[PDB]
Amino acid sequence: NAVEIQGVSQRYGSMTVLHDLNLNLGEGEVLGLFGHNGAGKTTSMKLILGLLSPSEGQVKVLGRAPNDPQVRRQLGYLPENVTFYPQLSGRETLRHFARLKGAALTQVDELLEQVGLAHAADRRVKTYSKGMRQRLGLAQALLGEPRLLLLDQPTVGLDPIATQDLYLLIDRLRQRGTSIILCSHVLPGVEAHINRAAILAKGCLQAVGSLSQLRAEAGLPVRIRASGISERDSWLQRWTDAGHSARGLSESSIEVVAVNGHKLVLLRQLLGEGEPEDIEIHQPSLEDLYRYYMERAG
Amino acid sequence: NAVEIQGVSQRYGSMTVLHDLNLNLGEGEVLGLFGHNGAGKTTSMKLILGLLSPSEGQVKVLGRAPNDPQVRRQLGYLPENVTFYPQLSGRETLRHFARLKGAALTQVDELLEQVGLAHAADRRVKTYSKGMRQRLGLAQALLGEPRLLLLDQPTVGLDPIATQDLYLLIDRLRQRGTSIILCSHVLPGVEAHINRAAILAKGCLQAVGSLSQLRAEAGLPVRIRASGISERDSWLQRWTDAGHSARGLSESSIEVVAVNGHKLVLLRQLLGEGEPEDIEIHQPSLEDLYRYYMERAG
Amino acid sequence: NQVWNIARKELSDGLRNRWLLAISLLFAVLAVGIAWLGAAASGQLGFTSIPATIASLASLATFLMPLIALLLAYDAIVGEDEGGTLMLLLTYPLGRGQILLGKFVGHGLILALAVLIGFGCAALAIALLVEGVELGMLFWAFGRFMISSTLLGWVFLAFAYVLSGKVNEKSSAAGLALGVWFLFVLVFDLVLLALLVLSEGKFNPELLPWLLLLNPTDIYRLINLSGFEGSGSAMGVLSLGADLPVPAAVLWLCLLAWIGVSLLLAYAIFRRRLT
Amino acid sequence: NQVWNIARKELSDGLRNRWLLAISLLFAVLAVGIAWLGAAASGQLGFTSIPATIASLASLATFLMPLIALLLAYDAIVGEDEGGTLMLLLTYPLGRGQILLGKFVGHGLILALAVLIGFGCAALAIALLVEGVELGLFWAFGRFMISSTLLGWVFLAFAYVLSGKVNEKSSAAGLALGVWFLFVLVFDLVLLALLVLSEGKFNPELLPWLLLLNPTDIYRLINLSGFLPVPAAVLWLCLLAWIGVSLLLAYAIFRRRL
Numbered sequence A, B: 001n002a003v004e005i006q007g008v009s010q011r012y013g014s015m016t017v018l019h020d021l022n023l024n025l026g027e028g029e030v031l032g033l034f035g036h037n038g039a040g041k042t043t044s045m046k047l048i049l050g051l052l053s054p055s056e057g058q059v060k061v062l063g064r065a066p067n068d069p070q071v072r073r074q075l076g077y078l079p080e081n082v083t084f085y086p087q088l089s090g091r092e093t094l095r096h097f098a099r100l101k102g103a104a105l106t107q108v109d110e111l112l113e114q115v116g117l118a119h120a121a122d123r124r125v126k127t128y129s130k131g132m133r134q135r136l137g138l139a140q141a142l143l144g145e146p147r148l149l150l151l152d153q154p155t156v157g158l159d160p161i162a163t164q165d166l167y168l169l170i171d172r173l174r175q176r177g178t179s180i181i182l183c184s185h186v187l188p189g190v191e192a193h194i195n196r197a198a199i200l201a202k203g204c205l206q207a208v209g210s211l212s213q214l215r216a217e218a219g220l221p222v223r224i225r226a227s228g229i230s231e232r233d234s235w236l237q238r239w240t241d242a243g244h245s246a247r248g249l250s251e252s253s254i255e256v257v258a259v260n261g262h263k264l265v266l267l268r269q270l271l272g273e274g275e276p277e278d279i280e281i282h283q284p285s286l287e288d289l290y291r292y293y294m295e296r297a298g
Numbered sequence C: 001n002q003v004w005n006i007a008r009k010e011l012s013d014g015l016r017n018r019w020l021l022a023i024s025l026l027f028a029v030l031a032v033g034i035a036w037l038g039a040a041a042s043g044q045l046g047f048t049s050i051p052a053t054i055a056s057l058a059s060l061a062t063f064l065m066p067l068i069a070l071l072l073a074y075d076a077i078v079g080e081d082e083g084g085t086l087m088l089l090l091t092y093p094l095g096r097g098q099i100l101l102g103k104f105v106g107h108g109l110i111l112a113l114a115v116l117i118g119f120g121c122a123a124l125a126i127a128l129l130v131e132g133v134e135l136g137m138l139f140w141a142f143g144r145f146m147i148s149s150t151l152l153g154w155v156f157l158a159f160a161y162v163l164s165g166k167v168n169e170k171s172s173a174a175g176l177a178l179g180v181w182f183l184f185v186l187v188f189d190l191v192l193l194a195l196l197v198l199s200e201g202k203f204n205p206e207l208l209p210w211l212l213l214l215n216p217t218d219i220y221r222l223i224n225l226s227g228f229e230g231s232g233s234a235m236g237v238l239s240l241g242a243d244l245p246v247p248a249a250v251l252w253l254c255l256l257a258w259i260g261v262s263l264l265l266a267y268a269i270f271r272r273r274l275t
Numbered sequence D: 001n002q003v004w005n006i007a008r009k010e011l012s013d014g015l016r017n018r019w020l021l022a023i024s025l026l027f028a029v030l031a032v033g034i035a036w037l038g039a040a041a042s043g044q045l046g047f048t049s050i051p052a053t054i055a056s057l058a059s060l061a062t063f064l065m066p067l068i069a070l071l072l073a074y075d076a077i078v079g080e081d082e083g084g085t086l087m088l089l090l091t092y093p094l095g096r097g098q099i100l101l102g103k104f105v106g107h108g109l110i111l112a113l114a115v116l117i118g119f120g121c122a123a124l125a126i127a128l129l130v131e132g133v134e135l136g137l138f139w140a141f142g143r144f145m146i147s148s149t150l151l152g153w154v155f156l157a158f159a160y161v162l163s164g165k166v167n168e169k170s171s172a173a174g175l176a177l178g179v180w181f182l183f184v185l186v187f188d189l190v191l192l193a194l195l196v197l198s199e200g201k202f203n204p205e206l207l208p209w210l211l212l213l214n215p216t217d218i219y220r221l222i223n224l225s226g227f228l229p230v231p232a233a234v235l236w237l238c239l240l241a242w243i244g245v246s247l248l249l250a251y252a253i254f255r256r257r258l
């Protein structure tokens, strides 16, 4: 019961950008928005913030209207291209932001240490790099007591260690009962830390739900990279006539695509004829799910 | 051959940002600058150009001083946080940059339709989104013949299909012998297109070479994953005592991590009693190499 | 309210920018130059007759101060939008009007502290180094001059906010600010005078004295010249209305009313700004 | 060279923005104001005589045109650096000098086109509205065009000089008034006081040359010859030298911006 969107349609000039986008989130649920580059990920987040007023739709933000600043009291947002005042000290910038949000001065230094920027604090934002500015934005997001935390493309600029640390932070905040709307373009690594997911192409919302239902309905086949299982053509002709797609690379490798829905028993036969030199089985990944659903819209 | 970083270091006023960097690349050599958030990757990337002057040593580019207009003529730069004049349309921006760069003025439209911004043209950069902005920056980067391209953090803000297309474009450019000093932090999937990868932390270029060469310089275990295959305890007791490092996860599965050499004879056991309800084989990828190098040497 | 936080960050910008030094140093150079280096137009090099300095200095101020206020404030709203920090700030629990008033109080305190500092070097500069001035008249005259100058600074600040809320880009904001600056000083006087001289030989004699209220630059000049200052003979423009717009608090109320209506206009425009 | 690309870039910026309709119309409203409403002090009426409306027009031009220049090229350099776009442009095969020269040429063509359109509209208004007093205006108003344009260029170059050193656009304006303040107020007042201090011993042979050291004084000498020790040609050459040294200093400061 965190955000309740009633079929919002938003128009920018004469160009519609959203049409009947009905979305919902639970109080403690984490929803991963994904979509095309020009779909509406950021604009939908901006509507959630209350920056723009939907022409056709009554959004409910934290069970209240988004115009009220009481919502923004316990709501945090991390903007993409998070640009900051370039002549304020990072410590000074974050202290000013806390003063705006009301958070205690004890929190600021501890939180700067928590993100991993205290070492390079006290130097102006201009000196920081694209990463440290992203980390300052992340520190802004975690500032205060955030009941509802809206992240926009948030791993942009961070390290794999920093990305996974943020992922654990998001999981912990889910444990604490906070609400997260995370939109990202690095689909790898977000399947574990995202409960519910939504995919939207153009304006219409393609689908919504947790990973399990979204995977099940698509029935997306599994991909198996292989290199020298038994021979160059031993494993090809046993599946070309078996009604299964299998393209045989010239370098003594066969790449078969199974369905992984009901033929789980056949997986035993898959690796049991001859000793294989190299096998690399990749299960149906949410990025492949994104590719499938984009192929559905168009 | 083309970019020779020999014996250089850079310091701001009182802080040494870059220490003893020696980087040598050649024609058609996809190099990568990987490192911790704030490790000097960008300051070195800028040092490739005339934006920064090397405090110590010299940075040969195309055999000439990088400050010569001639050197920049056969070069392309996609800067992280690409920022464009946000009042004139994308068509206007591409025409302008090509006019300073040197183009037929017909390559502009070809790139604009090629990058998928054809509909968005005329709309103006402010109304553009973070993605299309990054796509327009990439389209600018591909104006002319990019003898030496310098795409920095280029994958941020792009669709998975869009970043896949960008990687395919990197491959195509690598086919026609154009250098690319990649620096993207998105770790999964770059290594395939990376001819030579260089992980440099805050200290220095403590790692340089090809992914296969780096993988050799360091022994890395192979990754095996499962989710509820047979039982929780039987797998643990069977694999811990049989001279192996079995990571005993608590989700009704014992994901056993091999030495990366025993797996060739381990598969025979896996087919024996290990029914394949769920089996994932992932070779030690660039994530593992990055963690190894960063933690052990940093 | 949270208004003080935004005013605090604006004051911090004032110190981290050469603005506070620049505004106060140049404004004090203005003040000191008129007293010693000034009056050299007649050849009498140095004297500090309080009626003269607070009138010549008053005119040089009615030109300088609006321009300084406009330069400070034109990019308060448009500058944040171009910087990319405006969209972030609105996400905070701050009303659009609340941040507008915060920026207004911040810039106003910048210019008020600046004028106080600058004349504080001036006020001592006369008192200590002059020969036999009646300190009381000096004090109340420069007091009226300080408060009038800071009030004119505030009204032109508010004009800068309204134009900035109207505009889309920094350079166009500067152009409109320059237009608003030029209009009041050089055109609201000239067109109004021309109005009497030809449009009004006997067309409507009674209306011209009061209309000088519309322009804050004229109100400011009348307040600082008329005063309690002796030998109060007003030349052209002011003399019509120097004699009687019936005030001594009416001009002050009208100037504050201009600041008020302008702040309401800025709140109205800035509310509808986006899209 | 190829600075023309940057020049058309800010030409498009000026046309897309509201300067051209607020700088040319700025002169249009005042010039007709000074020519018909400028004798309103004792008798409102028009085109008293060409050299009359020229004197007041030049006097207000000194006050305002420098100020327009300082308000057109303070954000010119530092503004791009704040926007983060300057560095991407510095990646291109242009170099430090060509960027500054191109922006200067573009902004100078902005001011020149504004002067032409506005004072030309005023001149055609003088011709049509008023009697055929004289038309061979051309020498007076044309010299006004050239002199005002060169004054705008020299203060534009000063604005580039100050901008290339400031690191925050807001601070750039503070050092923009200073340059405007020094030439408008400080120079005349301080020079007059120094003459008063030196009663008869200032060596008046070197006062006209000290007047050269202020572009405003040069511009006011130029439009005061309707019918001096300093030749008119030298009176032009000195303003040209001011422009040259100002641009040289701006290029010198810009090279070490980062």
Ligand SMILES: Nc1ncnc2c1ncn2[C@@H]1O[C@H](COP(=O)(O)OP(=O)(O)OP(=O)(O)O)[C@@H](O)[C@H]1O
Residues within 6 Å of the ligand: A120, A126, A127, A128, A129, A130, A131, A132, A157, B012, B013, B017, B035, B036, B037, B038, B039, B040, B041, B042, B043, B044, B080
């Ligand atoms: N002009 C500057 N003055 C002072 N310090 C600077 C300046 N530019 C960068 N730095 C600092 O130098 C260090 C190295 O920056 P670096 O080049 O690693 O940025 P980066 O590579 O973009 O970081 P990342 O890519 O991980 O986001 C950082 O501490 C950064 O804040």
Ligand SMILES: Nc1ncnc2c1ncn2[C@@H]1O[C@H](COP(=O)(O)OP(=O)(O)OP(=O)(O)O)[C@@H](O)[C@H]1O
Residues within 6 Å of the ligand: A012, A013, A017, A036, A037, A038, A039, A040, A041, A042, A043, A044, A080, A153, B123, B126, B127, B128, B129, B130, B131, B132, B157, B158
């Ligand atoms: N202020 C605006 N005026 C007009 N159109 C706008 C505006 N802001 C956004 N748009 C439109 O919204 C779309 C881009 O915003 P959107 O939310 O799709 O970005 P996004 O999907 O987050 O992009 P990315 O994920 O690549 O950062 C385009 O149709 C764009 O023209």
Ligand SMILES: [Mg+2]
Residues within 6 Å of the ligand: A041, A042, A080, A152, A153, B129, B130, B131
């Ligand atoms: Mg986005």
Ligand SMILES: [Mg+2]
Residues within 6 Å of the ligand: A129, A130, A131, B041, B042, B080, B153
């Ligand atoms: Mg970087």
